[PDB]
Amino acid sequence: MKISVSKNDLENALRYLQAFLDKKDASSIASHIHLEVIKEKLFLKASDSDIGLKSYIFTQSSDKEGVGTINGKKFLDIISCLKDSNIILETKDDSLAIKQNKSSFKLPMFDADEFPEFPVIDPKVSIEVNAPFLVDAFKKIAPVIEQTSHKRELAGILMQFDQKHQTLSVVGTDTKRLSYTQLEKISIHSTEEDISCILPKRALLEILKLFYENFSFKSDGMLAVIENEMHTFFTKLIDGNYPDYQKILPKEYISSFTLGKEEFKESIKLCSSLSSTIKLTLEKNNALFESLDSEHSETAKTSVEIEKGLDIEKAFHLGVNAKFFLEALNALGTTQFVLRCNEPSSPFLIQESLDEKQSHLNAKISTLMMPITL
Amino acid sequence: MKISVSKNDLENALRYLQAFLDKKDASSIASHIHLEVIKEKLFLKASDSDIGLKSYIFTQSSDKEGVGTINGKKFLDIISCLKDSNIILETKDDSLAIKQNKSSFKLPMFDADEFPEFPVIDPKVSIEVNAPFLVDAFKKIAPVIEQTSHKRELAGILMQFDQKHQTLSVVGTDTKRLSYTQLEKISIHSTEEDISCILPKRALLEILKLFYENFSFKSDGMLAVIENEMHTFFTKLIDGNYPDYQKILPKEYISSFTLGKEEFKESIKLCSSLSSTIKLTLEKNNALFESLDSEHSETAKTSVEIEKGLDIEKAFHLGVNAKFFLEALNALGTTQFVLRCNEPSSPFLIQESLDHLNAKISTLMMPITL
């Protein structure tokens, strides 16, 4: 192996690959990145059976093609200490030499056959993603997903494909809040009419680092593979049947109040200094907030005026988890939000203002939430 | 007590007091700020026996004088979440009320009499600091002082006052490196011709957050008290004798090299990617750097051209600790540095080239063998 590459190209590829390495035992191949030069490209990959990344960068010059490995952490540390000019990488019998002007480094390579095979699938489902809407939905939904949840399938995010109606539904929950969206007019190529892929939280968080728009998503009902111009990412799916979210959603809502998002954030944040739960009191022209499960002797109260009068005969009292209410508001792209309610003891919905209106670039995430009693 | 104060003034004051609170036990008065209104001022204190800060802010309107307390962490959290308009603070029995228009809060107070009284000293030494030299010395030397030092007097920074010749010496060490400076022409008032104060690392760090120039330093040999227009700070001193740092320093050096600071920083940083220690080779027109305690078959090499020839016939070899060498260079204000050596196994010195507003820190360092 012998090549020249751009320092910036190489450093960037190495940063992304860090999260796929077990870095603590430097003597194990699990701490190494597999290297392969083929034609005018350097391929770098770090993976195991469950999750992995294969990246590539263009060579500036190419002299010998071949394979090798190198400790990924030490490789990034070295490159980040160099100038922004080309770097010469060259093997010397199970050792990689790294050269930039007057600086030179040797690191040992391991057997490249000890690296696991990068998997390849025959897809049952595939889409092209040319806009930010899907990763937006992933980013907005992620905070409600618990990796340690009891129900196996709730520890990841749900992607439910309806190729008949051309919708991709994206759903996450911890049983206390459920956040969802239904992305429209998605060109879904599938052998099945309805197929479900559950991505583990771990993999979801890596997808947010690696992709934005202009990538493909493919799956065979076992693995998910995602690819853009630079990267090929894969993860194993979570096996099982994610519960039907549409049967959990209430049919109708008695009341639907249009309220100020930032005003509600401020007030809830303010009251949550002393308590994880809050008592919300909605009147015709006011919203009152009080700390609820604070230690005794501690109180925090505030209110806010509602100019555009709510349809409230009396006074609606709702106990809410502060953090969960905030995160639901944080997932909304509008300046106002709709709070849809039945009784104080039953689930309530938080969603954007004009949620039925169609969007292109971003997802609209709605959140159903169990209230606190009293 | 009752007082209407500015949100930002109160917020800012509370942020500074956080480091002086033991926040983990909220049932302890160590987690509380002492509040007192007197005339046009709200005084806020956070302290124990060992360290403390007293601050104040102003009111413009009528108030009521009195005392009270409040959990300092909870108070900051509340005030940081409020709007940028006036905040009314008022005691109501054993509770502090906070009011900003539609927002209102009550928090339990503890007995203000349990609050440790803020110390007043009869100073045996005092200085007026009207320039950043001292805090500059503190900042530059602080990294060599380990707070977890098992030898007690080395856990703090030395301030050695020489009344007779108007010099303040400031010194830190961990036994592997010793960093020092002699601050000339300082108006020292003191009841002895020589006196020494050792400030704990803890306190040294807080001083850097609070003070810069235009402050007084005072001590009675037991507490240090530092004061500006805004704040009064104190700390307990570390008791015992700081070792004679002056007898440690070599009298003469066989070799003295004037070298580039940033180039050495870069080359050492580069080699320290694979090692904690480095082998330095100085030749007439070259400086070579190699990783030394790197693992089997791991190597990092680089070199730098020295345009102005060094004064050596045979190449000089020196093993160094990378991090200690870097921090010694980080303490220098000049673009070049003087490295002074005897044998490769003898202590070596780093200092500025060509040694009002900045202190000059020299660092003496034990080398690594081979």
Ligand SMILES: O=C(O)c1cc(-c2ccc(F)cc2F)ccc1O
């Ligand atoms: O099994 C469960 O108890 C359960 C509960 C919910 C759920 C119900 C009501 C609500 F307001 C929010 C939720 F996340 C969502 C999913 C789920 O599996």
Ligand SMILES: O=C(O)c1cc(-c2ccc(F)cc2F)ccc1O
């Ligand atoms: O305990 C010690 O032996 C000891 C050693 C030093 C010291 C000696 C030489 C040197 F190059 C650096 C040092 F910090 C400085 C202070 C000190 O107390």
